[PDB]
Amino acid sequence: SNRAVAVLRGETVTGTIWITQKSENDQAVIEGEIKGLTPGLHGFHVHQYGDSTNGCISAGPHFNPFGKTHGGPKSEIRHVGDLGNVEAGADGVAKIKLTDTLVTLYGPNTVVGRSMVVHAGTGNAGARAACGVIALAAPQ
Template identity: 35%
Template sequence: MIRLTSTLLCTFAMVSAAHAAPGDKAVAEMKGLEGQILGAVTLIETAQGVLVTGELTQLSPGPHGFHLHAVGQCKPPFATAGGHFNPDGRKHGFHDGAGSHAGDLPNLHAASDGKAVVDALAPGLTLSGGAKSLLDQDGTAIVVHAKADDYKTDPAGASGDRIACGVVTKAR
């Protein structure tokens, strides 16, 4: 397994408008195009943003674009998840001088056995109310793409097809 640790934003989709406080959690069950369960992601609100952790399996080895999308829906081929979560109206990519989408995350790297571990921070995002909440009325989705994000090409880093998706929901 390869562990991805960096400052980033990440999550699945379709979250309720319920309020969260630091320490509150949300979850996203990741599914592939055929409906197979590929793993789960846990989101925890912190004072610095949303901590995103989890493990995925059955991915092709190598890097994959990994993003928070603006709509909490995951109907294959996952176009229903909309574009990247972008409440500030910025361009895509960490290499953009004006800043990136709030939903831009570092690439997810799958090992030769198809497993990938996520351990990242989505700075400035919340699970509570407001424009930067991942649990807004239309929810949020986490999407895995077929290819690596180049961190510069707008709107999605030339990361290819959407191959996995999960809707973010408030944990009980």
């Protein structure tokens, strides 16, 4: 499909994030809303797995298919799953629209079946506050 959606679930943070992409060669658009955030900037990431058998823990690590490293030559590689930080507006909702990412719904790096995770900013989920599987949706 040219359209996917993640419904984020968490104790307090929830949301709905759409991904739309006309073809393998076109840039995807990520758009939606995240609710229940404490005020300020929070991390927003694609993680490797959609597995939600263990809350947001089973999402596994950041999705970094190109292998960006901390330093050295490969530190200049783009981290595909890094969607920056997000924040709620005055109305308490974060309106997300990201048009310049490398996220794709096609080819070997497709994110279908993986997860989107919101990171706050103590427990075994670290800062992971909500997560949802990137699901196939009806094409537009």
